[PDB]
Amino acid sequence: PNQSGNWKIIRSENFEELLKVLGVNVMLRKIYVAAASKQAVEIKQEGDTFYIKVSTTVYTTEINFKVGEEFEEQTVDGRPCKSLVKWESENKMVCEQKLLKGEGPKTSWTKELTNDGELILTMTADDVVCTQVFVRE
Numbered sequence: 001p002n003q004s005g006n007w008k009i010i011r012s013e014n015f016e017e018l019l020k021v022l023g024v025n026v027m028l029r030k031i032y033v034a035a036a037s038k039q040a041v042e043i044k045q046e047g048d049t050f051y052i053k054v055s056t057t058v059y060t061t062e063i064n065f066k067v068g069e070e071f072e073e074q075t076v077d078g079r080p081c082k083s084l085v086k087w088e089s090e091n092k093m094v095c096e097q098k099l100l101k102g103e104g105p106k107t108s109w110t111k112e113l114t115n116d117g118e119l120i121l122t123m124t125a126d127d128v129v130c131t132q133v134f135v136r137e
């Protein structure tokens, strides 16, 4: 469908656990967990072109991409990567990430807008998956 709008988080699973297995220090995890709970997500979708802004008190990021065209962003733990998004289905996109420098866990994310109007974001590092669900304001 159309993902454009302001999205508020209603459910999360395994966020701290994802950070923990990525090596994020416990004091920083507490800060990020509290920030993720209050995050604001703005999306502007224009066909295959996406602008996504994720805002919190400690971390704010803008992501710009077109499906099928490589772009640069960061992993969850802050490492620069090259990314490529593809449609897995009509409603779900998948992003594969490759570090610009060095080696690390295989990281990825997915975003799906359900028929319910729920936006489901998953973030993965190797075998560990975090899921966050949003609804449109």
Ligand SMILES: *C/C=C(C)/C=C/C=C(C)/C=C/C1=C(C)CCCC1(C)C
Pocket (backbone or CB within 6 Å): 032, 033, 035, 036, 039, 052, 054, 055, 056, 059, 063, 075, 076, 077, 109, 111, 121
């Ligand atoms: C398609 C939607 C995407 C790719 C959203 C990505 C959002 C993040 C990688 C958010 C990361 C955060 C942290 C790394 C700590 C602060 C809290 C968050 C959730 C904003």
